[PDB]
Write a protein that binds this ligand. Structure first.
Ligand SMILES: O=C(O)CNC(=O)C(=O)O
Ligand SMILES: [Mg+2]
Ligand code: NI
Ligand SMILES: [Zn+2]
Length: 331
């Protein structure tokens, strides 16, 4: 078995290897990358996502989210308070302000220590989940707006034609902005490209051990667990690496820098934080190996998780027994 310790692997494809996305994902899996839940892909030196980032300031963040924390430093939830719209240029200035800017630090490890010590005492503002793309249309390799769609994958594997679309999302981050512990909708893959700015630190649990994280989370968030049998689908709970180590939960961590891709694999729980002003682009995707994970994915039916139009078909076809209850949660 390849990668039996479930380490995060880093890949350096050549320009030739970067042509066929599906093939390269399958190669990474052949080397055991999926066992970690997360992989880094450094693009060939010839490649670029677009020519410059000099003209992005007029993109609108229609609903910036202030991430307010409750709990203790290592075990907390966050809720998202909606703020007034602002442009990317206004958000960048905000991120760089004395109130929100990254503090002085020695290295990534010192910054990680400061994040876990101090996150809860601040409420950073995140521009998340903005439909759109920063890939130049002429970028033909690993262009996250030109991937094969999950609807087409389901149709190719299973023969059923379904409605729905699959488009990318932009994320504009600042120091301390936080992504809570989650797997993807329907335990899909994700791919994330850090277009510009400061790094993003990731934490991940191997898919084969995801239920260990879920059992810890039910212990640590006992009211939330009683409210919903899949509350991590709400994407609000944080647990620090120190707490994970104290409870024996297997995980790994890595820092993504600008110009790098990360892939999350089916049922790989992940969480993380931004180091400073940045912009990432991410999308879900599927492969043949996902289908079995999609069929087994947990679902939130309490009403909190509320998701895209396109998840309807996935539930309906892959999980027909769960469909009625899940749809009630959506309505
Ligand atoms: O970058 C973020 O805030 C969150 N991204 C992801 O969870 C991802 O790409 O799957
Ligand atoms: Mg612009
Ligand atoms: Ni994710
Ligand atoms: Zn729920």
């Amino acid at each position: 078995a390849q990668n039996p310790n479930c380490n995060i692997m880093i890949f350096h494809p050549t320009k030739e290897e970067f042509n066929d996305f599906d093939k390269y994902i399958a190669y990474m899996e052949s080397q055991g990358a999926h066992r970690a839940g997360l992989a880094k892909i450094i693009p060939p030196k010839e490649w670029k996502a677009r020519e410059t980032y000099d003209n992005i300031s007029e993109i609108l963040i229609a609903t910036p989210l202030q991430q307010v924390a409750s709990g203790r430093a290592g075990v907390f939830t966050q809720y998202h308070k909606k703020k007034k719209a602002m442009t990317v240029g206004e958000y960048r200035h905000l991120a760089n302000s004395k109130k929100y800017q990254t503090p002085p630090h020695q290295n990534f490890e010192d910054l990680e220590r400061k994040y876990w010590k101090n996150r809860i005492y601040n409420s950073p503002i995140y521009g998340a989940d903005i439909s759109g793309s920063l890939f130049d249309e002429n970028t033909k390799q690993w262009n996250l707006g030109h991937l094969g769609t999950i609807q087409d994958l389901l149709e190719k594997e299973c023969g059923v034609v379904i409605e729905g679309v699959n488009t990318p999302y932009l994320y504009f981050g600042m120091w301390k902005t936080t992504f809570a512990w989650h797997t993807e909708d329907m335990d899909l893959y994700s791919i994330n490209y850090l277009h510009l700015g400061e790094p993003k630190t990731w934490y991940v649990v191997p898919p084969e051990h995801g239920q260990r994280l879920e059992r810890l989370a039910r212990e640590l968030f006992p009211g939330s667990s009683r409210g919903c049998g899949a509350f991590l689908r709400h994407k609000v709970a944080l647990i620090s690496p120190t707490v994970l180590k104290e409870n024996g939960i297997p995980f790994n961590r890595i820092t993504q820098e600008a110009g790098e891709f990360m892939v999350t694999f089916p049922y790989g729980y992940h969480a993380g934080f931004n180091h400073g002003f940045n912009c990432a682009e991410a999308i879900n995707f599927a492969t043949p190996r996902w289908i079995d994970y999609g069929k087994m994915a947990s679902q939130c039916s309490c009403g909190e998780a509320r998701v895209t139009f396109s998840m309807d078909a996935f539930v309906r076809i892959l999980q027909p027994e769960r469909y009625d209850l899940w749809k009630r949660g959506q309505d």
